[model samples]
Every structure is written in C-alpha cells, then in structure tokens.
Target chain A: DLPGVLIVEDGRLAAATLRIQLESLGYDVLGVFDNGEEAVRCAPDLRPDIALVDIMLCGALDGVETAARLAAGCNLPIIFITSSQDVETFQRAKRVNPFGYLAKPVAADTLHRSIEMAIHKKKLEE
Target chain B: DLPGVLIVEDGRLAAATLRIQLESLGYDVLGVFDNGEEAVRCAPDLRPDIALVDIMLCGALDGVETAARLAAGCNLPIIFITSSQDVETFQRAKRVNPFGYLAKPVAADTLHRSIEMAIHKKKLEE
Candidate 1:
C-alpha cells in the first residue's frame, strides 16, 4: 500500500484546500482534522505513514511541540509547512529534524517534490 | 606543469601584491602583465592550460572579451574574477560561458575552488 497522510491545521478552509491537493496527488488522506490535539488523539489509532502539520496550529500543541510529541510517541516522519519567516522559528523547526518544509502560498510542485524526496530519503534510511 | 595565470590590473601596488600572492599559491603565472592587450599577445605563446583573468582588465580585452578570444583562438579554459556587481555584466559573461566567476575581494579559498572546479569540469567534458 502507498503511504497514508494526516493533515493537521486549525484553518478549516486551508486544511480543506490542502486535503484536496494531496488527494489529487494520490495520497490517502486519513482526515482533515482542525487542530494538533485532535491529530495527536487520532495518531495512535490512525498510525499514518506521514503527517503534514502547520506551524501555527491554534491549540495547546503548536506545530513544533506536536512534532516533538510525534517523534517521542512514535518515530513519525513529519514535515512542517509554515509561513513563519522568523529566523528563530526556522531554527526551532530545523531542530526537530523535519523531513520536509514549504514556505507559504505553497507551490504544489515544491511540496510534491519535497514530500517525494523525503519519503525516498526515509526509505533509503530504512 | 601547473596551469598559467595572468593578473591584469591597473593599480600598481595592488597588481604587485597580487602577483606575489598568486606566485605563492603555486601557479606558474606567465607574468603579472598589467594590461589585457599584453595578456592577449602572450596567450599565443603561453597557450596555457587555464587562465585566471581579472574581469576589469585595464585595456581593450577586459575579462569577457579576453575569455572569448582565448576560447576561440586556443580553446583555453578561463575563470573570471571580478568586482562588478551589475546584473547586465553577469548575464553578458554567462553568454560567453566562462568556466568560472568570483565576485571581488574574492576569498582565496573561493578563488581556489572555482579554478579547481572549472578545470575538473573541463577534464570531465574531455
């Protein structure tokens, strides 16, 4: 089976749009959940192959913290897509060893390539 | 034999100083010929394997034209070192397809690597 993906973001409209894009690209979208907590709550049951989480999730778990949780709870391949241009945020995101990233108003081609490359890289590591 | 280099600069002290540095770096410089015309004249006899020519050569040849002539006449590999930041000059230089370029106050390491890479690329092409 091809990999499954979970999309975690607070923006319902943006999440819906991203869900459509990922589905169009032939990824199995588990659900377009609207917060990081719900994603964490659902992660154990879903056990998806990859997670595309937003940096500014509107809940107790922002993207970086959630990524840490995922990495600690299970060795998850997570990619942080964010519009945050601040250097501090960039450094923090890098610290989590995110498999991929997309700066916002995301280019579909860039996102597609990054995910493909990251998945390929993970497979190579395995 | 190592590749030959020509430093064509108008500033007397700078030219004198650069000549010493180039000599120390183990390049058998044809000479510290201060003008592009002199360099062009010497090129026929030297027929150097590679030429590290300055972009702002004092006379007619400058860097781009000298590179064009050497490439056309003797099929020499050239690396252009320059301080000219203008986009137009860069595009023009690229059109001629000079093997290397270095923006000035060029670091020795950068200059060295460019020359090495250009020569390596040339060898690979051959």
Candidate 2:
C-alpha cells in the first residue's frame, strides 16, 4: 500500500488541489482538514505517514502548533506549505523541525520531491 | 548566472559522474578535486555556492573536516555524498550541519532536488 498523507490547509480550493497533487504523486490521502483543531483531533486515529500543513490556518491553533501536538504522540514527518517568507515565521517553523518547506502554489515536481525527502528523513531516524 | 558547485570525491569515475550530473542540473562546475586537501586549499578561491563532498575522501583530512574548514572561512552550504548509512557516520555528518545528504550513484531527480533544496535552505538562513 502507498503511504498515507494528512493535509491541513484553510483555503478550500488549495486543500483540494493539495489532495489531488498528493494522490497524483501516488500517496493515499488519509484526510483533509480545514482547521488545526480538527486535524489535531483526527490525526491520532488516521496516523498518516507524513503531513502537509499550511502555516496560515484560520483557527485558534496554527499549523506550527498543530504540528507540535501531532508530534507529541506520533513520529510522522511534516512539510510546511506556506507563502510566508519572513524570517520570524521561518524561525518559529524551524523549532518544529519540519522535514521540508514548500512555497505557495507548489509545483508538482517540488511537492513530489519534498514528500519523498520527508519520507526518507523519517526512515533515517528509524 | 547559475550557482557554481565544487565537488570533492576521491574516485576518478565518481567525480566525473558528479560533475556531469551537476552540470545537467544547470549548475556551474566550479571545479572537481580528488581529495579533501586540494578541495580545502582551492575552495577559498573558487567560492562555489555549495559543495558536494564524499565522506571517504582518500586523505588525512576527510570530507567532514574539509567542510568544517571551508565553513569557517566562507558561509556556504555542504551536501554529503556517501554510501555510509551507519548511525555513527550520520552522527558525525550531523555535526557539520549539511544542507542535504545523497547516497552514492544518486539518481538524476534525487540529485537535482537535493541541490535545489540545499540552495533554498541556504537562502532562508540569509
């Protein structure tokens, strides 16, 4: 079976597009959530192999915080999907130790490669 | 102009192969050296955007030590090319804080993606 992916993006269209991209890359989409709260709640049960999260989630918990919560229980790797290029935002994301960071409107090849690298990184740790 | 790359590998065939790979990825081949000693000596003048180093360079100064020396003088990124997957070797490589790691006989896509990611990571730092 292909590895499963959990996607958390607030933008409806973007989320759908990410799902399509993930599927095209041969990964199974475990689920897609619009908010960090729902993602944090459901991730434990879904147990995805990797997560693609947007930093600007429109919820009480943002992507970085949500990733931290998921990491507390699961050892899955995360790749941040964001257009934010500011140093401060990147500093916060660095603390979470994301495997990769993709700029917004991620190209198909870039997304595919980042996921592959994230999976390889997680395997290296194990 | 495309970013220049310096390659340091002891094997004659491997160094030639890596140069072709980097050139195909649209990177300038600043130079290719046979050992860490020559690489460390010439790196200051070449000032490549990044270095692709082999861990098992046949010299008293290995890739890790050569990277340290280059990093001390110039703020450039290093990506290790190695066949060693043992925990101890990885631990040492981590200390150098490489931008990426690629196994020997790396595929075209993997090598290209690693270089792109390494360049992006270096940009984020600055």
Best by lDDT: 2
Two-chain complex of model 2, DockQ on C-alpha atoms against the true structure? 0.15
> Candidate 1 on B33-95: residue-level lDDT in tens?
666677777887876777666777656666778777767776778777666456666566545
lDDT of 1 by residue, A7-64 (tens): 8877777687778778788889886666777778878788877788887777788888
**lDDT (tens digit, per residue) of candidate 2 on B1-126:** 999998888878888888888889899999888778888888889988998888776666878888887677766798988874588776676556455556654778789888887677656543
The RMSD of every model to the true structure, in order and in angstroms, is 15.1, 15.0
TM-score of chain B of 2: 0.63
lDDT, candidate 2, residue A77?
79
Winning candidate number (DockQ): 2
Off by over 4 Å in 2: B1-84, B91-100
DockQ of each: 0.02, 0.15
DockQ of 1: 0.02
